[PDB]
Structures are given as C-alpha cells and as structure tokens.
C-alpha cells in the first residue's frame, strides 16, 4: 500500500512591484496541500481561510507581540532582502547563446523547420522574432514557453517551419536585458 | 496577486514520513539557498550569493521546529487526513542543443510532485549511471505541489541512450522518460 | 555581511 | 557585542535620565532591546523597538532616523531605578540573548 | 511573571542540583543562561514543544528538559567550584521577548 503522509507547510512570500514603490507580505499556513491561515500585510490582521482555520488566527491574533512581529517582518524580511536582492539577484546579467539548427537535412524545396534555441539567458524577459529576406515569419513560427533550468539560467526555443528557396536568408532575432543591441543569427538554404 | 517580484522568504517544509524537512529561500522561483537540517550550513546556490549574503541555519532549526509543532496540532484538528498522492509529470530535455563531441547537460523535470517524497535517478544504455548527477531541492508551486529538477553532466554520442527514472506513491510504475539525440 | 532573515511561523495553541 | 554604553552614569531623582547607546553595525532586521538589573536579581525587560520611537508604562526609547543610536528615556528617576542597564540588539528569531558591559545608572536624591 | 526554584542552594563538589522554572502562563519557549561575574550571561538551551530547540556551548552535564505544560527543569552533574553562578531562566511566547526570572544563586564549595 501507499504510504501514509501528513505535510505541513509555510511561506513567507514576499510581492515587490515598481522598485520599493510596493511591497506586500502574505505568510501562507498551509496543511497537505490546504491553505488554512494567512497574514496579509494590506489586511493587518491573520485570516482563516478555511474552517481548519479560525482557531489559529484568532490565537495569533490575540498575542500582541506576535501580531506585531508579523507586521514588522513587512520591513524586517522583504524591504531588507530587497535590498540585497538589488546588489546581487536583481543585477544578475547572462547573455544568451543563440544558434539555429534543422530538424532534418536540408533540401531544397522540401519541407524543414529551423529551431533557433536561445539558451543560458538571465534573466526571464526574452524577445525572439523569425525573420525570412527582411519579413517577419508570423504564421509558421511555434514557440515554445520560458524552460526554467532551475540552475538560474533560462532557455526557450523557437521554431519556424519553413521551404528553403534557392537563396533564401533567414534570422533569428533575440532581444534581452543583457545585451545593449538586439542580435541575430544568420541561415542560408545551403547552394 | 500581480507583481514584478516575487520572493518566497520562507518556504518551510516538514512531513510525518521520515520524518524529512526542508527549508530555502526562493527568488522569482529560482533557489537562494537550502539548509541542510543535518549539517546545519546553508548552502547558496550561486557563487555571488556565497560571497555578500548570509544565512543562519539556525534560523532553519527553530522554524521546522514550529512546523512540527504545528503538525502535530492540525493532525488533530482536521480529523487524521492523509494527503493525497498526485501523478507527477516528468520531462527530460537538453540545457544546450546537443551537438556530438561537445559535452552537455540532461535536464529532468518532474513537476506536480505531492507529497514531496520521490526518487529521480538517470540509467545510460539501462545501466544506472551514477556519477556526474545532481538535482535541486523542492520548488515550491503556489498549489502547494513541488516540483524538483535533476541534472545528468553527458556526453553526446550515438553510441549511449538514456532515461529518467522516477518513483512516487502516485505512479503504480516506475515512470521512464527516454532522451535520445 | 549581516545575516538575512526569514519569516517567523506563529505557534499552534494546542498545548 | 554589536552596542556601546558608557561604564557609568549619574542622573538626578525626579527629573529625567536619558541613557545612550550606539549601534553602528546595527541591521535594519535587528532590534534595539533594553534590560535592567538590579542587584540580586533577574534581568528585567524594559522596552524594545526598531525604527523612530517607542513608549510602554516603563520608559521611552529613541531611535535615531539612521538607526546608528538609541537613547532609553526614564521619565522619572526613582530611587529604585538604580542598576544596571543592558543596550543589546536582537532579531527575534528565537536566538539566545546576549548581553554587555551595561551602563552602571546611580539615581541620586 | 518566570518563576525559579530553589532561590538559593549550597552544594559541594561532585553532587547535582536540579533547578526549575515556571515560565510565564501562555509562554511556550524556555531558555536557560548562567551569569558569572566574569563571563557574564553565557547561553545554555532554549526548549519549546517539549524539545531542545537550540544548544549553547556547555558541556554534557548541563542537560534540561521541558514537559508539557512549558514548564523545564535543569540538571548539573559532578559540581565543580567554577560553576557557582546564578542560573536564569529566560520565558518566551515562542520567539519574541524573553522575560527573566528571579534566577539560582547556585554556590559550589569543597
């Protein structure tokens, strides 16, 4: 049989938007997979969620210093991190690596598709654009979403299903905060 | 709730079976940093992190211990229910396009992990290859699932295949997700 | 150079 | 460890005693405590704060704005507020308590 | 507020005391300090939910315990001089302000 197992759970989640404009913390008490208990900063006080609940919020709620300490963690857990975040995570900058590779051997006048595989990239906003002779490909162009390979470093591939014509020039173009110009890659249906 | 950072300072975890804990901090859902509740050292997940921030794994030590605690309390409250097995779903693909020759990394994603026990290991040509592999710790998911991420350190060859294995409580069957060049 | 923090969980009262 | 007090401080009964303390190294998740002991007893926990200022029944204490300094404020100097008064820092995160030198306070009538 | 038990003890060489506290009604972490005039307020242990949360840097004759209704209780073992001193007793709701109490004068002689 499956073994019998009993999760409990706490996030201490911290939501930064427009710098240090707006912060918003949302401690999370979470049994199995059951949110039962939060602290919401824009709320100020714990919350039941569900009726496993209102026992713990209103103990928690009840103690003074507790309450207290939960609101200063606003400034005492997020501000203060942020501010660390901004001089190593937020500044963290990884070029990605582009290159453009067939799905099958090139022929001429024969169906392919072109994978242009962005990887290695730091952080998450990515831009990436098919091109054919100066025309942006929009209709055979299959992206997939954000690959996350969890060693901080994003990938993402795109891929356009194309006919390569004699003389056809096809580019890749990506955009991101690391570089200081968009770049391109460059292929030709080989003569 | 919509934001342009989110930051989990504070995923704890802790589970009857084992019993097992965890403890790391999370940035845009990428791992700071993890505490090894034995060890008792935190350990960062990048060489900037090791250099200009600190972490006292005592800090880890007294919040698993509330996590316990209040284990114990709630276990009580909603009657003994038992979480439930999800099926998780597992994907292997490459950190690089795979060119033969030029070393690269496997990467295996196994994603809606519930409860967090699970065995993720790597077999070339049905052989378990042991050296060269790690994963990563629990991530957290805001369904309260996990997910986690094994690597597999290869080298590109017609010659070898490879699979992902994975064990959980919701698969009858060890499940197997073959990668091939 | 300072040590980070986390956040602290509140206590279950079933003492 | 991370405070400063000076050794000794008089102060007059009736009127106000303003204790400093300094705390250049301190973190902005750290907090500013104050205890007092007086002889043959336990220390007692006085007032604690963060940012700005703070008052309970006991006594007041000031934080400056760049936090590098505090000052407990006793409002009235008794004659029973003579100990010695301990400037620590702590982050309240269930760690132990550490104490200095302290400020050794004589109220004098 | 914290209470202690004894207040006062005379012990000598090689015996053990055992020293307990009542922590503030509500409060469920305990910690333990000795204060000597020449090491000041060293830490001990700290207990919550019957369990040693965190551990000082004392040898393994000083060992505690916490029961069920949060009140702890302190053991020495083989007394030597050098730990005459007074043991404090430091009261928590869990991990907030710790409130002493009155303490052991605990004196060791040959």
């Known amino acids: 049989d499956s073994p019998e197992d009993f999760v409990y759970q706490f996030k201490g989640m911290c939501y930064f938007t427009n710098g240090t404009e707006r912060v918003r913390l949302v401690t999370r008490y979470i049994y199995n997979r059951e949110e039962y208990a939060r602290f919401d900063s824009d709320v100020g006080v714990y919350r039941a969620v569900t009726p496993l609940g209102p026992p713990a919020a209103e103990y928690w709620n009840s103690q003074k210093e507790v309450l207290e300490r939960t609101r200063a963690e606003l400034d005492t857990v997020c501000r203060h991190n942020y501010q660390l975040e901004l001089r190593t995570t937020l500044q963290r900058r990884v070029e990605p690596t582009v290159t453009i590779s067939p799905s099958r051997t090139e022929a001429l006048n024969h169906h392919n598709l072109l994978v242009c595989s962005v990887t290695d990239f730091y952080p998450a906003q990515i831009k990436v654009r098919w091109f054919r002779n100066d025309q942006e490909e929009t209709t055979g162009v299959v992206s997939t979403p954000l690959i996350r390979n969890g060693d901080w470093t994003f990938q993402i591939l795109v891929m356009l299903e194309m006919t390569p014509q004699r003389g056809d020039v096809y580019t890749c173009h990506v955009e991101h905060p690391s570089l200081q110009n968009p770049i391109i890659v460059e292929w030709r249906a080989q003569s | 709730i919509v934001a342009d950072h989110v930051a989990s300072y504070g995923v704890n975890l802790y589970q009857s079976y084992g019993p097992s804990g965890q403890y790391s901090h999370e940035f845009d859902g990428d791992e700071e940093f993890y505490v090894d509740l034995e060890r008792k050292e935190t350990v960062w997940q990048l060489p900037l992190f090791r250099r200009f921030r600190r972490f006292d794994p005592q800090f880890a030590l007294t919040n698993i211990a509330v996590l316990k605690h209040n284990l114990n309390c709630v276990i009580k409250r909603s009657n003994s229910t038992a979480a439930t097995n999800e099926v998780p779903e597992v994907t292997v693909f490459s950190k690089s396009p795979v060119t033969l020759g030029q070393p690269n990394t496997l990467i295996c994603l196994v994603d809606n992990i519930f409860p967090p026990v699970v065995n993720i290991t790597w077999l070339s040509n049905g052989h378990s290859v042991t050296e060269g592999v790690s994963e990563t710790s629990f991530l957290s998911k805001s369904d309260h699932s996990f997910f986690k991420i094994s690597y597999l350190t290869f080298l590109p060859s017609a010659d070898e295949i490879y699979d992902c294995k994975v064990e959980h409580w919701g698969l009858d069957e060890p499940l197997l997700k073959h990668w091939e060049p | 150079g300072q040590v980070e923090l986390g956040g602290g969980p509140g206590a279950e009262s079933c003492q | 460890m991370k405070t400063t007090q000076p050794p000794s401080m008089d102060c007059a009964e009736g009127r106000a005693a303003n204790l400093p303390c300094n705390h250049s190294?301190?973190?902005?998740?750290?907090?500013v405590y104050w205890y007092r002991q007086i002889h043959s007893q336990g220390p007692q926990y006085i007032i604690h704060?963060?940012?700005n200022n703070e008052t309970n029944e006991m006594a007041s204490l000031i934080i400056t704005e760049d936090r590098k300094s505090s000052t407990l404020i006793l409002p009235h100097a008794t004659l029973r507020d003579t100990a010695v008064y301990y400037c620590?820092?702590?982050?309240?995160?269930?760690?132990?308590?550490?104490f200095g030198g302290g400020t050794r306070l004589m109220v004098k009538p | 507020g914290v209470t202690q038990t004894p207040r006062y003890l005379i012990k000598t060489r090689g015996q053990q005391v055992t020293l307990s506290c009542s922590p503030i009604s509500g409060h469920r972490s305990v910690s333990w300090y000795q204060q000597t005039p020449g090491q000041g307020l060293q830490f001990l242990f700290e207990?919550?939910?019957?369990?040693?949360?965190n551990k000082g840097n004392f040898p393994g004759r000083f060992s505690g315990r916490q029961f069920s209704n949060s009140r702890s209780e302190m053991n020495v073992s083989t007394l030597e001089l050098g730990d005459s001193a007074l043991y404090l007793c430091a009261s928590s709701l869990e991990r907030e302000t710790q409130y002493f109490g009155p303490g052991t004068r605990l004196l060791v002689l040959e």
């Open positions: 207990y919550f939910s019957e369990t040693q949360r």
């Open positions: 620590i820092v702590s982050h309240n995160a269930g760690n132990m308590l550490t």
């Open positions: 190294t301190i973190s902005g998740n750290e907090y």
């Open positions: 704060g963060l940012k």
